[PDB]
Amino acid sequence: LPDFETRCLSSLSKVFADAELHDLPVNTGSAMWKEVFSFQVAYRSPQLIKSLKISAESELEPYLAIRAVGLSPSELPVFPNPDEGYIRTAPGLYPDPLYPLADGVHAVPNQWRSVWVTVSLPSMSEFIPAADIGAESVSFPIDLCFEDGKGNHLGAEKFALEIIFQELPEQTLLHTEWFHSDCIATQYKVEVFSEAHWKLIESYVHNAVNHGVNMLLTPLFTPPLDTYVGGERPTVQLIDVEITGVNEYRFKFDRLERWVEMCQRLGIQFIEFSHLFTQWGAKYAPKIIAKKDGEEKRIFGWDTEASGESYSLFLDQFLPQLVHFIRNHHLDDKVFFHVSDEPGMKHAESYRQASDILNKHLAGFSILDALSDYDFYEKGLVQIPVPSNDQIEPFIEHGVEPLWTYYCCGQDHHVSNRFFSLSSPRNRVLGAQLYKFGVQGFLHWGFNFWYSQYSKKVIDPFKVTDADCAFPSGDPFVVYPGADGPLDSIRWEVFREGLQDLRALKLLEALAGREKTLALLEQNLREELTFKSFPDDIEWLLSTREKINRAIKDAYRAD
Ligand SMILES: CC1=N[C@@H]2[C@@H](O)[C@@H](O)[C@@H](CO)O[C@@H]2S1
Numbered sequence: 001l002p003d004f005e006t007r008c009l010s011s012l013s014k015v016f017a018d019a020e021l022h023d024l025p026v027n028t029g030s031a032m033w034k035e036v037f038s039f040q041v042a043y044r045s046p047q048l049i050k051s052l053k054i055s056a057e058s059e060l061e062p063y064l065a066i067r068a069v070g071l072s073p074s075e076l077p078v079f080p081n082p083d084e085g086y087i088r089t090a091p092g093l094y095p096d097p098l099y100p101l102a103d104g105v106h107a108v109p110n111q112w113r114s115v116w117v118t119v120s121l122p123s124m125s126e127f128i129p130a131a132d133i134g135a136e137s138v139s140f141p142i143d144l145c146f147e148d149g150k151g152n153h154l155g156a157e158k159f160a161l162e163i164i165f166q167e168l169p170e171q172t173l174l175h176t177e178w179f180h181s182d183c184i185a186t187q188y189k190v191e192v193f194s195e196a197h198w199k200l201i202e203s204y205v206h207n208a209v210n211h212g213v214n215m216l217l218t219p220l221f222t223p224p225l226d227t228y229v230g231g232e233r234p235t236v237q238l239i240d241v242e243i244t245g246v247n248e249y250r251f252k253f254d255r256l257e258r259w260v261e262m263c264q265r266l267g268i269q270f271i272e273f274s275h276l277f278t279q280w281g282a283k284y285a286p287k288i289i290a291k292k293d294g295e296e297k298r299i300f301g302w303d304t305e306a307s308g309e310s311y312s313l314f315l316d317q318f319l320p321q322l323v324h325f326i327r328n329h330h331l332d333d334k335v336f337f338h339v340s341d342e343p344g345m346k347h348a349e350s351y352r353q354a355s356d357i358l359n360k361h362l363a364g365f366s367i368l369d370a371l372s373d374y375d376f377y378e379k380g381l382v383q384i385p386v387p388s389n390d391q392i393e394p395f396i397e398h399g400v401e402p403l404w405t406y407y408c409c410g411q412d413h414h415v416s417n418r419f420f421s422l423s424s425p426r427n428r429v430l431g432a433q434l435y436k437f438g439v440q441g442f443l444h445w446g447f448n449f450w451y452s453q454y455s456k457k458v459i460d461p462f463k464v465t466d467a468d469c470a471f472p473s474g475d476p477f478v479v480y481p482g483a484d485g486p487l488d489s490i491r492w493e494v495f496r497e498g499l500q501d502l503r504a505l506k507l508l509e510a511l512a513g514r515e516k517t518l519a520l521l522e523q524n525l526r527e528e529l530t531f532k533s534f535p536d537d538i539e540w541l542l543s544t545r546e547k548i549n550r551a552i553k554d555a556y557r558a559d
């Protein structure tokens with residue numbers, strides 16, 4: 001029999017196959033009802049052992065999954081001059097995708113590998129095992145077993161999960177991760193809005209909702225994002241347009257009704273309409289296709305100026321009809337609009353002209369856009385600014401409400417992000433930051449972006465994770481394409497943990513008040529928590545959440 005060693009670890013370790021493992025063992029934790037709780041087990045052999053049999057024994061087995069932590073390439077792990085908090089800076093193989101056990105799991109000579117364990121807890125009232133509804137908590141063991149192909153025992157670890165008998169309350173943070181339907185169609189080689197495409201969209205949206213996405217980017221017309229000037233992405237257009245004469249249109253909303261019904265069925269709460277003017281300037285219209293005498297033709301795009309009377313007349317016809325749709329489906333308090341993403345100060349006049357067209361028709365509706373110039377908000381050009389987390393200080397200082405934030409490739413220094421080359425505490429700490437600063441919404445551009453920069457070519461996300469050496473690996477997507485639907489990354493699992501932390505902090509505030517809650521979160525910090533300053537440390541984050549959980553368990557409750 002070969003030598004075989006194991007180590008039980010938290011969800012916040014990243015186990016590399018080319019390095020010694022310094023992380024300390026973790027064999028206990030706590031959670032609430034409705035929480036997803038995760039851990040992992042690292043293992044190593046001097047020998048090549050193929051097709052390990054890995055099993056768990058627990059009363060929690062109906063709620064438990066086990067997956068293999070796979071390795072992904074990164075050619076651009078970092079931009080120049082990365083800060084000292086980065087875990088690695090070299091190109092190589094990084095732990096990231098989570099694969100089904102049925103795909104096969106191996107021990108590879110003198111390499112630490114990992115399996116990842118997910119426990120998706122129900123409500124107390126749906127829980128199948130016996131449980132004392134009058135106890136403050138109950139602990140359950142989870143035993144994980146490794147055998148070879150022939151049934152010889154190789155290793156084991158025991159984890160003890162304490163479940164506290166309170167429910168993690170429903171998320172009220174607004175959270176959008178931009179959803180690229182085109183990337184689904186080109187990966188799976190299906191036509192846009194075929195029945196095969198709709199089935200895949202549903203699977204991808206269900207994953208998003210399960211990970212705390214409650215606001216979905218909704219493609220009225222092909223979203224004008226990450227597209228070179230004079231280029232295109234695959235047509236994704238929910239609105240049907242018939243051109244009936246020069247500057248004269250008729251509209252049908254049937255595909256939009258299908259999309260909205262899908263959102264309501266799967267648990268999306270807010271409809272975020274796609275941008276109506278081109279990125280980084282608001283200079284042009286999106287690609288728009290229409291039918292003339294049965295035949296499809298492009299009527300708007302990079303050859304139709306945003307300020308031209310042609311696009312103005314089109315929107316004067318379209319937008320009142322979309323408002324009628326919104327009122328007829330009782331969506332009045334459930335919608336957001338976009339003008340144009342990421343304008344600079346040099347683009348303020350064009351952004352204003354575009355905003356003025358929408359404001360003729362969309363009075364009473366929420367309008368937001370990603371942009372970070374406070375000087376740009378002062379002049380009333382944008383209703384809800386969404387500043388980046390490294391530029392948020394002036395928005396906080398001036399009491400802007402509702403407060404939103406985002407991050408992307410530009411947020412490479414100090415702040416929370418989700419790059420391969422950053423630690424899992426640096427990802428998960430966002431939750432605590434959103435709590436302390438009273439943030440109302442979080443936006444990310446990259447649920448499943450699987451093209452290169454400017455959408456010049458299709459890439460394979462299992463081979464190219466940096467959009468062809470443009471964006472640090474991890475920025476453009478959190479899910480990979482499995483055979484029948486999405487595969488999670490460890491980064492996506494850790495992001496959900498941050499959201500859960502925010503929900504736990506808000507519960508402790510309901511029970512004990514904001515002053516005591518903030519005092520607990522900041523206990524023994526050398527410096528105040530900010531978006532740029534925090535302990536990047538596994539023990540700090542785990543012990544802080546354990547303290548929050550203990551305070552909830554011990555609090556005096558009303559019925
Ligand atoms: C809201 C955003 N808009 C941009 C996206 O379209 C991408 O280019 C991304 C790259 O990191 O950067 C920003 S994040």
Ligand SMILES: [Br-]
Pocket residue numbers: 001002003046047
């Ligand atoms: Br051996």
Ligand SMILES: [Br-]
Pocket residue numbers: 170171172173502503506
């Ligand atoms: Br929340």
